[PDB]
Amino acid sequence: HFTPTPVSYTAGFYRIPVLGLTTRMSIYSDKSIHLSFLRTVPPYSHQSSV
């Protein structure tokens, strides 16, 4: 959990959205941390409702 953290730290503060192709974790999905971040694929948490 290193590359997603720096990626969200840099672009998130600039209000520059970032699309996460290889991110299946909802940790950076609080709508507060990484306010400018997009998920190309859902995390496993959604699969929990499955």
Binding site: Y9, F13, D30, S32, I33, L35
Partner: protein
């Protein structure tokens, strides 16, 4: 830990930049309730005046 005494938004942004560069605990004081998008858990910002 570090202590910050910001008096402007730019000061808070610069402090957040330096803190993320350091990734360490830093204390900052805001004259009121300051909603800051900087979500680094290592930064502790205290509103000087409580909400009325």
């Amino acid at each position: 830990a570090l202590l910050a005494f910001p008096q402007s938004q730019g000061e808070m942004m610069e402090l957040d930049l330096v803190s993320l560069v350091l990734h360490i605990p830093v204390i900052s004081i805001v004259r009121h309730e300051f909603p800051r998008e900087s979500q680094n858990p290592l930064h502790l910002q205290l509103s000087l005046e409580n909400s009325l």
